[PDB]
């Protein structure tokens, strides 16, 4: 099955600490390319490889090194990560360097890379579930649940809803980007909301269970931590609510 895999998908690093981003494909693709997307802008090409052991500089190669030891792998090396290398990095691959009409060039899921002077501003989320109002139930015969994730930094988060242990997407809407709690500070924490709407009678069944889950991507065990508070590792934080008879 065709897919492009990047590791890691989310990375928090300290300035000047060497790191390498991996990109791989099992389709024996000859051409693979790295891009960086700054927010609101397009993709700027860093390096591409027309085949194994062929490397050419793109538009923004500075501060990056690559290798193409085989077809499968095209790693992106950041010799000395600096704050201006914080970006969303995309690795792409294609069957041939000049694709035919029927052929697709596949893109990885993107790598959200954050380079910081220190990690003291990293905070995990607080999450709460807010039950639907009896007025919406009365007025529309529907029930909207709201989930609130607060106090987290950075916005390396994924939010999903799970109803009776099964993830649901029907009736779900999540904000496109997290908003800053105190926009003045660059180190402001973030918050994110989402809504799930079900039928009024479904909410009134007490056997139905509702769970909002926020996957937070943070530090690793490898990362050093000196502050008193709990180390903000990669973790899941959830809040739950049960249906309620009228």
């Amino acid at each position: 099955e065709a897919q492009v895999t990047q590791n890691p998908r989310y990375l928090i690093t300290v300035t000047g600490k060497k790191l390498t981003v991996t990109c791989s494909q099992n389709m024996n693709h000859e051409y693979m390319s790295w891009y960086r997307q700054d927010p609101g802008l397009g993709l700027r090409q860093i390096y591409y490889s027309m085949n194994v052991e062929v490397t050419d500089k793109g538009d923004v190669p500075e501060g990056y090194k690559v290798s193409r030891k085989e077809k499968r792998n095209f790693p992106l090396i950041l010799e000395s990560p600096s704050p201006n290398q914080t970006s969303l990095y995309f690795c792409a691959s294609s069957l041939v360097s000049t694709p035919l009409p029927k052929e697709t060039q596949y893109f990885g899921p993107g790598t959200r890379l954050l380079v910081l002077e220190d990690l003291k501003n990293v905070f995990p989320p607080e999450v709460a579930v807010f039950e639907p109002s009896e007025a919406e139930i009365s007025h529309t015969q529907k029930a909207t649940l709201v989930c609130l994730a607060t106090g987290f930094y950075p916005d390396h988060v994924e939010l999903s809803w799970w109803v009776n242990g099964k993830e649901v997407h029907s009736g779900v809407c999540t904000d496109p980007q997290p908003l800053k709690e105190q926009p003045a500070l660059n180190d402001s924490r973030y918050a994110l909301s989402s809504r799930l709407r079900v039928s009024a009678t479904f909410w009134q069944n007490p056997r139905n269970h509702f769970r909002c889950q926020v996957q937070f991507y943070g530090l690793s065990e490898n990362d050093e931590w000196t502050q008193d508070r709990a180390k903000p590792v990669t973790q899941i934080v959830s809040a739950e609510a049960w249906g309620r008879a009228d």
């Binding site: 051409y31 390319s33 609101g40 802008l41 397009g42 993709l43 700027r44 090409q45 591409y48 027309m50 050419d56 793109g58 538009d59 995309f90 792409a92 360097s97 000049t98 694709p99 009409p101 697709t104 060039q105 596949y106 893109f107 899921p109 993107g110 709460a128 579930v129 807010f130 039950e131 639907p132 109002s133 007025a135 919406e136 007025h139 529309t140 529907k142 909207t144 649940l145 709201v146 609130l148 029907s170 009736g171 779900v172 809407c173 999540t174 904000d175 496109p176 908003l179 709690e181 105190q182 926009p183 918050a191 909301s193 809504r195 709407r197 079900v198 039928s199 809040a239 739950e240 609510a241």
Partner: protein, 203 residues
């Protein structure tokens, strides 16, 4: 020079209609390619279609290309817009050896047709706590525009299109909450233009 230009930073269009996205480029390359991509809100990147500089207008599915080589314009046309088409679309120029140059994209918002609007602002209490509440504006028309909060201690998100697939029911909604004293749901969206018949529950 080497520039690709997407004039429309943002475009709004109703469901099932068609939309045309313009793309202009200046380049010293005389043999090249044009790529179109769709970036979902998840930021996932997706290849749609590629246009060869020596070929006729490429077409595939609901997408179609209007290649006008003389003006260096290669517009992509999307017909029968769906809610899933709401995304940021990118036009990209590539050469004969894998190099490429990207424009800065175009955000498309597809507005759904709300057939039975019922604008209302509801208050929701915390499953776990007290004081901690949230105000919910929902069921309004897609032509109603929610306004960024102008009070830094009150947080208000942009519009949000949810789709209850089982009922073929689409509705917009927006959320507002705050920590301040005497924050009330009637006051939350005063910075926006809410319908005059917006339901505010009295009991």
């Amino acid at each position: 020079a080497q520039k690709v230009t997407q004039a429309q930073s943002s475009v709004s269009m109703p469901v099932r209609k068609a939309v045309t996205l313009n793309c202009l480029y200046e380049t010293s390359w005389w043999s090249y390619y044009i790529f179109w991509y769709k970036q979902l809100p998840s930021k996932e990147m997706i290849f749609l279609i590629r246009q060869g500089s020596d070929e006729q207008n490429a077409k595939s599915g609901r997408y179609s290309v209007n290649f006008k080589k003389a003006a260096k314009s290669v517009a992509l046309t999307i017909s029968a817009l769906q809610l899933e088409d709401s995304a940021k679309y990118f036009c990209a120029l590539g050469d004969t050896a894998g190099k490429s140059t990207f424009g800065d994209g175009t955000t498309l918002t597809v507005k759904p047709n709300i057939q039975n609007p019922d604008p209302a602002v509801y208050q929701l209490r915390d499953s776990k706590s007290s004081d901690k509440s949230v105000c919910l504006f929902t069921d309004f028309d897609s032509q109603t525009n929610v306004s960024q909060s102008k009070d830094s201690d009150v947080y208000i998100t942009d519009k949000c299109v949810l789709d209850m697939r089982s009922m073929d029911f689409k509705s917009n909604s927006a959320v507002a909450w705050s920590n301040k004293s005497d924050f009330a749901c009637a006051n939350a969206f005063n910075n926006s233009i809410i319908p005059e018949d917006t339901f505010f529950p009295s009991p």
